[PDB]
Amino acid sequence: QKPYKETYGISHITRHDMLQIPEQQKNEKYQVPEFDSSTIKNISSAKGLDVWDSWPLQNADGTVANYHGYHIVFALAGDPKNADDTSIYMFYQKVGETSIDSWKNAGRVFKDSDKFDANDSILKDQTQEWAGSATFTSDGKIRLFYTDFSGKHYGKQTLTTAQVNVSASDSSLNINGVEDYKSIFDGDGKTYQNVQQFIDEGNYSSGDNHTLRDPHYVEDKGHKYLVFEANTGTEDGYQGEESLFNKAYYGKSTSFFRQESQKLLQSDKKRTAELANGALGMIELNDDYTLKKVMKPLIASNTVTDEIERANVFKMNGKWYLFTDSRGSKMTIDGITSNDIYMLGYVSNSLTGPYKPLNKTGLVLKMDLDPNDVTFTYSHFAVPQAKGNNVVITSYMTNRGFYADKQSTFAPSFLLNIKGKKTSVVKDSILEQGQLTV
Ligand SMILES: [Ca+2]
Incomplete structure (x- = not known):
């Protein structure tokens, strides 16, 4: 088996960069803050749902619409005890308020019928709705992107879109229904x-982890794109x-390559490494998405x-x-443990590459998963701001231990x-739960 070198013209998260992380992550500038359990309330308008991965409606440039x-x-919600209830809900708050009680709930985006009414054969086998993005179009529409999960068909994952038709009520927002509900992409x-490769290798029993989810919408130069986990x-x-x-x-170096x-x-972790081929992928969309x-x-x-999630x-x-968010338990880097969870990060002069790691390693955030901690945050997401050098980091928070009246x-x-190629958690920057702008 002869050593070679082949980049395929794309950037890479290398083992050398990642091996620097266990020592670097000890610095507080890379650590997600700890939030005391006494400061936390449920989303009251969720009416007892557990609310997980969320993403705001964004202008094309990424700023909040x-x-x-x-x-x-938009947020995934349901109950920890029944995954197939996992569904997308549309929350909203009037611009200018930051209190968590200001978040109102317009309910599920989709009726159970919507996937069947849609002229789409893959939407038929959907069993869960997973994360994505949403954009406020020039026509004034709410253009949603999310992941079609099919528990029936070997965990197939399909990048899906739909326009969410919404009315205003002087009091509130209300979902009238959806249209242009269709699949976009499921691997090539x-x-x-794609899921076929996953099936052909022995589905779940192979130890492989087939992903194709979390599409993020971004425009550049009058081109529409989706960046996504794959x-x-x-x-x-390939793996x-x-x-x-x-x-x-x-x-x-080649010296380091031989040693590592x-x-x-x-x-x-040899086998896990051979199957590890996560990617942040990209596709261009037509004006009809x-x-x-x-x-x-x-x-x-x-x-x-x-598994590099939430592109x-x-x-x-x-x-x-x-x-991208990534779990230490699924990595193969010595020094990185199952107690660590990360947001990695890269920088480039152009949207399409090439990408170099922030803080020399790719480490941006590390969240610890110790037990003596009561609370935990997950699924961290950087929300760009109109002006300034700071982005807002949203996440969802769970509690160690069950309470009938506490949810995610x-x-x-x-x-x-964020400045140049360096990032730093701002000390004393704690906002309200779910606050999007500063
Ligand atoms: Ca794989």
């Missing part, structure tokens, strides 16, 4: 793994035993992990920043300072 005098937050095998296909850098010999996945590769090949072009991934994570990208102060809720947002 103003719809009819309201901010809009050669650039992005896995590499056969013609980028397999051979992938551990591509030097591009290691970085640094041999140790990896004897590590008990249908597939126009499958573009090469913005970055891949071969041998490092199979996020936006232009800010002249540079493009790219973020909006975490207190905080600020992340």
Whole structure:
């Protein structure tokens, strides 16, 4: 098995960069704040739902949109005891308020019938609704993007869109229904793994982790795009035993490649590394939001992990920043443990690449999963702001231990300072639960 070097023209999360993280993450500038349990309330208008991954309605540039005098937050919600109830709800608050009680609930985006009424064959097998993005179009529409999950068909994941038709009521917002409800993309095998490859390899029993979800909408130069979590296909850098010999996945030096590769090949994470081919992918959309072009991934994570979630990208102060959430338990880097959860981050002069790691390693946030902690935040997401050097970091917060009258809720947002290729958690920047702008 001969060593080689092949980048496929895309950026890579290398083992050398990741191996720096266990020592770097000890610094407070990279650590998600800790929120005392006494400061936290349920989203009252959720009426007892557990509210998880959320994303705001954004203008094309990523900033928060103003719809009819309201901010809009879509969120996955349901109950921890029944995953197939997991569904997208549309919350909203009138611009200018930050209190958590100001968040109103317009209910589920979709009726159970909507997937059946839609001229779409993949929507028929949907069993859960997973995360995505939403944009306030020039026509004044609410254009939603999310993940079609099919528990029936081997966990297929499909990038899906729909326009959410909404009325205003002087008092409130109300969902009238959806249209242009359709599938967009589900992998092509050669650039992005698809469920067929997953099935052909032995579905779940292979240990592989097939992802294709969390589309994030972004425009640039009158082009519409979706950046999303995925896995590499056969013609980028695909998974397999051979992938551990591509030097591009290691970085640094050929000296380092030999040292790391041999140790990896004897590590008990060897197999996990061979199957690890996570990717932040990209496709161009036509003006009707249908597939126009499958573009090469913005970055891949071969041998490092199979799962880089919640792709996020936006232009800010002249540079493009790219973020993804990732679990330490699913990584194969020595020093990175199951107690650690991350937001990684990269920067580029153009939306389409090439991307270099922020803070020299890609580390932006590390959230600790110790037990003696009562609360935990998850699914961190950077929300760009109109002016300034700070982005708002939203997340959802859960509590250690069960309470019949406490659910997953909006975490207190905080600020992340972004300057050039360096980021820093702003100390004393705690906002209200779910606050989007500062
Ligand atoms: Ca894989």
